[PDB]
Design an enzyme around this catalytic site. Structure first.
Site, PDB file in Angstrom:
ATOM      1  N   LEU D  37      -1.232  -9.575  -4.467  1.00 21.80           N
ATOM      2  CA  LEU D  37      -1.702  -9.175  -3.148  1.00 21.80           C
ATOM      3  C   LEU D  37      -2.967  -8.338  -3.300  1.00 21.80           C
ATOM      4  O   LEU D  37      -3.501  -8.173  -4.401  1.00 21.80           O
ATOM      5  CB  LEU D  37      -0.622  -8.392  -2.391  1.00 21.80           C
ATOM      6  CG  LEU D  37       0.693  -9.119  -2.103  1.00 21.80           C
ATOM      7  CD1 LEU D  37       1.536  -8.295  -1.150  1.00 21.80           C
ATOM      8  CD2 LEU D  37       0.459 -10.512  -1.547  1.00 21.80           C
ATOM      9  N   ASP D  38      -3.451  -7.811  -2.181  1.00 18.79           N
ATOM     10  CA  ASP D  38      -4.638  -6.966  -2.168  1.00 18.79           C
ATOM     11  C   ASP D  38      -4.417  -5.862  -1.139  1.00 18.79           C
ATOM     12  O   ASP D  38      -3.282  -5.538  -0.772  1.00 18.79           O
ATOM     13  CB  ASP D  38      -5.898  -7.802  -1.899  1.00 18.79           C
ATOM     14  CG  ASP D  38      -5.939  -8.370  -0.499  1.00 18.79           C
ATOM     15  OD1 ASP D  38      -4.977  -8.161   0.265  1.00 18.79           O
ATOM     16  OD2 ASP D  38      -6.945  -9.024  -0.156  1.00 18.79           O
ATOM     17  N   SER D  39      -5.511  -5.262  -0.668  1.00 19.07           N
ATOM     18  CA  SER D  39      -5.395  -4.088   0.190  1.00 19.07           C
ATOM     19  C   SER D  39      -4.912  -4.459   1.588  1.00 19.07           C
ATOM     20  O   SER D  39      -4.026  -3.796   2.146  1.00 19.07           O
ATOM     21  CB  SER D  39      -6.745  -3.382   0.282  1.00 19.07           C
ATOM     22  OG  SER D  39      -7.228  -3.000  -0.992  1.00 19.07           O
ATOM     23  N   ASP D  41      -3.443  -7.354   2.886  1.00 22.27           N
ATOM     24  CA  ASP D  41      -2.107  -7.926   2.986  1.00 22.27           C
ATOM     25  C   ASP D  41      -1.020  -6.926   2.623  1.00 22.27           C
ATOM     26  O   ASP D  41       0.166  -7.247   2.751  1.00 22.27           O
ATOM     27  CB  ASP D  41      -2.003  -9.173   2.107  1.00 22.27           C
ATOM     28  CG  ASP D  41      -2.275  -8.884   0.655  1.00 22.27           C
ATOM     29  OD1 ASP D  41      -2.496  -7.704   0.314  1.00 22.27           O
ATOM     30  OD2 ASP D  41      -2.298  -9.840  -0.147  1.00 22.27           O
TER      31      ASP D  41
ATOM     32  N   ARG F  50      -9.458 -11.362   9.210  1.00 24.12           N
ATOM     33  CA  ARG F  50      -9.538 -11.201   7.764  1.00 24.12           C
ATOM     34  C   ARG F  50     -10.771 -11.892   7.199  1.00 24.12           C
ATOM     35  O   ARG F  50     -11.408 -11.384   6.270  1.00 24.12           O
ATOM     36  CB  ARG F  50      -8.275 -11.751   7.114  1.00 24.12           C
ATOM     37  CG  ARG F  50      -8.012 -11.202   5.736  1.00 24.12           C
ATOM     38  CD  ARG F  50      -7.137 -12.133   4.927  1.00 24.12           C
ATOM     39  NE  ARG F  50      -7.255 -11.868   3.498  1.00 24.12           N
ATOM     40  CZ  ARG F  50      -6.563 -10.938   2.850  1.00 24.12           C
ATOM     41  NH1 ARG F  50      -5.694 -10.174   3.499  1.00 24.12           N
ATOM     42  NH2 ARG F  50      -6.744 -10.770   1.548  1.00 24.12           N
TER      43      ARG F  50
END
Ligand SMILES: CCCCCCCCCCCCCCCCCC(=O)OC[C@H](COP(=O)([O-])OCC[N+](C)(C)C)OC(=O)CCCCCCCCCCCCCCCCC
Ligand SMILES: CCCCCCCCCCCCCCCCCC(=O)OC[C@H](COP(=O)(O)OCCN)OC(=O)CCCCCCCCCCCCCCCCC
Ligand code: SF4
Ligand code: SF4
Ligand code: SF4
Lengths: 115, 207, 156, 79, 178, 114
Positions: D37-39, D41, F50
């Site tokens: 994952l990342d920031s 999500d 996003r």
């Protein structure tokens, strides 16, 4: 019976007009046409939200004044009475008390609108 | 005396120069390159850290009552590293005189707002932001003023094309107004009009 | 007593009504709105022709695009037009509305209202003399004189 | 408080994110390295938690909430 | 100098006559009756309405409406493709392409005017050194199509061959004032 | 190498601001697909959020990031309030822009553009 007749005739005239207004012309319905009108742009909310009222006190007062009118309306008959002094006195008292209530409201700033 | 040329009086030049000395020696911490023009106009250039103090002094001080903000502009000069020349033109009704204050900014170098001084500057600073990209501080409501609601770019920047990057039309498919890249039926015609012969030797730039 | 003749006369009547009663909409954007006014003025009395400015699109029959149409205003114009009920006509007044005009090469102008709505008549000028806008109104009247809708329905 | 039902609701919200593969999902899995994952999500997951339990939580904490166990402990400490 | 519009009011002096006059004004609606009288007066005046399209609004020779390319009385075209008209046209509405005519003269092949870009300013006819391009008096040239409003050399030449009897006289009238 | 900071004295505080903004947008999308009567789902909106965020993921100067966050908050204001209509919102999706291919050869077949 004649009053019923005339009033129903008017109902039918209006309804005929509306029928031939809704079924005679050519239509082309689509959402952007049937959507509400707010001066070219989209509404920010619904018109079914509380629309504050600033003359609520004046409306309440209007109720009681309508009742006082209902009590004043029988004068055309009350003047055919033998006891004329009583009718005169009672009518004067009624109108004076009405005016005094109005004056109290006025002074206490009820007839002025909440801002 | 000559009927075509414009009558020139030095009295206003002297008045404005004396007042410029006044301002320069009363605000040394901010003032740069005071100057007066052939036409009688005073121009006070400053460091942007001095915006609010300078404008407040010129509004409130007794010998300087410039308390009407006529205009508030910007000027893109892509050459210099600090492109935007922010300008504050002011007016004194007590002395029937005007004055102009200038600062400098950059794409990433914002300055302070003067709505605490002149409430007239709210919309002018919003306009500067919308048109050139200069950001102001402590602004109550800094948003767009003139451009479209989803417009990308700052059109008065010299680097922005006169005709923009997009173009609007109506599409029956989606039943909406859409934005498509620009495509013109006639392209704007660029005319090279500058004469190759020096015209004003008083402004000659020595090499 | 041919039905085709009867239909032609009926269509003449339809068009006469929709023509001698053209209620435009109070929709003026720029200078050209002043000449619109002046065409409402005594010298050129609009009502004399049956023309009446109604402010609601749901009651109007035509809209005169009287000035420049920016990209920030085109959605509202298309919405108003959409909200006008058929039969609905449009008149482009001036050079700003027809092809952008003096602001054709601008980043915030639609180069013609004919991109956002369909236009029946184009009135050139900057601004068009109120006399010219009236000439255009009557040109529209004649165009309506030549709709021939019920004849088409009968030929289908 | 209840570190058992808390964890059930939490793993439920995780499974419901629908961006992760349950193969490497646990109560101490690492959002970034383990689950990939990342920031942002992770912001989404922590906001799904905010919704579930209703208690609005800062970012100063939602940043350190880097594994389901940390979520469980933060929910337990605040509620 | 200056004057006051609503400070005229001075200190208050009141009599019975003044009070009664103000009372009548407030009770009989004096000031409104006067507006009624004005509107009445206007009803019995002659309306300024002209009967268009039969009787028309006045104009002057300087009126600048529809464009036209003229000719010399010999029939030869006045345009020489100098291009001042498109060099100054502040709307960039004019478009020109020149070429040596077979006889060797300097003439145009293209001369187009987007009358949806023209602001009808007149700069082209005051720039033309041969009084070729003019802005005629015609203003009743509306259309049902955008394309019709994109004039070329032939359209302007035909207009010139259609209005010369009027353009020339208006010029003869106005050319001393220039 | 020394300049004045707008808000953030480093990239981490700017990232904090960016995350706050992402939360605001993620929470707002549903209310504006409801209000504006958009014909898209709630997932498409958040994917678009996003994507527009990643469009500027490469930045490293905190000042550029601060100004991008300011612009994003301006847009989020224009959207929370209905100052902008469904038109400006669906401008983001480019439903009509024919998508130019990144294949050198197609770009070669249609036009001289690189
Ligand atoms: C007190 C109030 C007094 C005022 C009310 C008095 C009004 C009386 C008017 C009488 C005229 C009757 C004819 C009006 C018909 C107009 C409707 C219309 O234009 O639709 C065209 C329609 C169009 O037909 P169409 O088949 O060509 O439509 C094809 C599809 N479109 C339109 C999308 C292309 O024609 C008719 O079908 C009407 C036939 C006339 C007879 C109807 C009865
Ligand atoms: C011994 C005698 C015993 C009998 C007792 C009776 C004695 C006689 C008493 C006479 C009293 C006068 C008649 C009363 C009517 C007038 C009431 C009135 O004066 O209202 C005034 C009101 C306020 O006006 P304003 O200037 O704003 O003052 C505010 C207070 N500071 O402003 C108004 O109300 C008027 C404004 C209305 C504007 C609407 C447009 C008016 C159009 C005018 C048309 C006139 C044509 C009349 C046609 C009548 C035919 C039926
Ligand atoms: S065409 Fe001319 S007069 Fe009409 S709106 Fe445009 S600039 Fe104004
Ligand atoms: S009148 Fe003015 S705008 Fe029109 S074609 Fe001539 S120069 Fe151009
Ligand atoms: S200014 Fe006159 S002569 Fe010159 S190109 Fe234009 S129309 Fe021709």
């Amino acid at each position: 019976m004649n009053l019923y007749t005339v009033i129903f005739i008017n109902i039918l005239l209006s309804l005929t007009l509306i029928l031939v207004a809704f079924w005679l012309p050519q239509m082309n319905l689509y959402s952007e046409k049937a959507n509400p009108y707010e001066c070219g742009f989209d509404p920010t909310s619904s018109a079914r939200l509380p629309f504050s009222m600033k003359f609520f006190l004046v409306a309440i007062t209007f109720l009681l004044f309508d009742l006082e009118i209902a009590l004043l309306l029988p004068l055309p008959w009350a003047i055919q009475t033998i006891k004329t002094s009583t009718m005169m006195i009672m009518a004067f008292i009624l109108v004076t008390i009405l005016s005094l209530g109005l004056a109290y409201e006025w002074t206490q700033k009820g007839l002025e609108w909440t801002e | 005396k000559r009927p075509t040329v414009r009558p020139r009086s030095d009295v206003t030049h002297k008045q404005l120069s004396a007042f410029g000395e006044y301002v320069a020696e009363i605000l040394p911490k901010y003032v740069q390159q005071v100057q007066v023009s052939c036409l009688d106009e005073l121009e006070i250039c400053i460091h942007p850290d001095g915006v609010i103090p300078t404008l407040t002094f010129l509004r409130d001080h007794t010998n300087a009552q410039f308390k009407s903000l006529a205009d508030l502009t910007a000027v893109d000069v892509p050459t210099r590293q600090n492109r935007f020349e922010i300008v504050y033109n002011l007016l004194s009704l007590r002395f029937n005189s005007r004055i102009r204050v200038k600062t400098y900014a950059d794409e990433l170098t914002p300055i302070d707002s003067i709505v605490s001084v002149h409430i007239a500057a709210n919309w002018y600073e919003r306009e500067v932001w919308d048109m050139f990209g200069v950001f102001f501080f402590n602004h109550p409501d800094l948003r767009r003023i003139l451009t479209d609601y989803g417009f990308e770019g700052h059109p008065f920047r010299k680097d922005f094309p006169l005709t923009g990057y997009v173009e609007l039309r109506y599409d029956d498919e989606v039943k909406r107004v859409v934005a498509e890249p620009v495509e013109l039926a006639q392209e704007f015609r660029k005319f090279d009009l500058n004469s190759p012969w020096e015209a004003f030797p008083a402004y000659r730039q020595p090499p | 007593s041919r039905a085709e003749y009867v239909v032609t006369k009926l269509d003449d009547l339809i068009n006469w009504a929709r023509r001698s009663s053209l209620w435009p909409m109070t929709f003026g954007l720029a200078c050209c709105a002043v000449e619109m006014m002046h065409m409402a003025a005594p010298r050129y009395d609009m009502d004399r022709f049956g023309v009446v400015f109604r402010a609601s699109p749901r009651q109007a029959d035509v809209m005169i695009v009287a000035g420049t149409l920016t990209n920030k205003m085109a959605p509202a114009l298309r919405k108003v037009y959409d909200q006008m009920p058929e039969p609905r006509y449009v008149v482009s007044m001036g050079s700003c509305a027809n092809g952008g005009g003096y602001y054709h090469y601008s980043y915030s102008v639609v180069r013609g209202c004919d991109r956002i709505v369909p236009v029946d008549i184009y009135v050139p000028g900057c601004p068009p003399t109120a006399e010219a806008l009236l000439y255009g109104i009557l040109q529209l009247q004649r165009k309506i004189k030549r709709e021939q809708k019920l004849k088409i329905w009968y030929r289908r | 408080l209840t570190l058992d039902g808390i964890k059930d609701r939490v793993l439920y919200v995780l499974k419901l994110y629908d961006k992760i593969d349950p193969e490497k999902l646990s109560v101490n899995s690492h959002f970034m390295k383990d689950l990939g994952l990342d920031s942002l999500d992770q912001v989404e997951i922590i906001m799904a938690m905010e919704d579930e339990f209703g208690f609005e939580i800062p970012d100063i904490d939602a940043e350190k909430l880097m594994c389901p166990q940390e979520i469980v402990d933060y929910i337990a400490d605040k509620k | 100098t200056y004057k006051y519009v609503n400070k005229k009011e001075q200190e208050s002096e009141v009599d019975m006559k003044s009070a009664t006059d103000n009372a009548a004004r407030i009770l009989m609606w004096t000031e409104l009756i006067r507006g009624l009288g004005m509107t009445l007066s206007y009803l019995f005046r002659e309306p300024a309405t002209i009967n268009y399209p039969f009787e028309k609004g006045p104009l002057s020779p300087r009126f600048r409406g529809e464009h036209a390319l003229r000719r010399y009385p010999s029939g030869e075209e006045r345009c020489i493709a100098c291009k001042l008209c498109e060099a100054i046209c502040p709307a960039q509405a004019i478009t020109i392409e020149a070429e040596p005519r077979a006889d060797g003269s300097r003439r145009t092949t293209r001369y187009d005017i987007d009358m949806t870009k023209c602001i009808y300013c007149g700069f082209c006819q005051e720039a033309c050194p041969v009084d070729a391009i003019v802005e005629g008096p015609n203003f009743e040239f509306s259309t049902e199509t955008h394309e019709e409003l994109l004039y070329n050399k032939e359209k302007l030449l035909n207009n010139g061959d259609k209005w010369e009897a009027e353009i020339a006289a208006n010029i003869q009238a106005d050319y001393l004032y220039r | 190498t020394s300049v004045k900071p707008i808000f953030s004295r480093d990239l981490n505080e700017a990232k904090r601001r960016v995350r706050e903004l992402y939360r605001a947008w993620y929470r707002e999308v549903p209310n504006t697909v409801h209000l504006m009567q958009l014909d898209i789902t709630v997932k498409q909106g958040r994917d678009k959020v996003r994507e527009m965020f990643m469009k500027n993921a490469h930045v490293t100067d905190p000042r550029v990031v601060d100004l991008l966050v300011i612009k994003g908050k301006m847009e989020l204001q224009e959207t929370i309030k209905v100052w902008k209509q469904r038109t400006h919102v669906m401008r983001f999706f480019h439903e009509t822009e024919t998508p130019r291919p990144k294949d050198f050869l197609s770009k070669f077949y249609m036009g001289h553009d690189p």
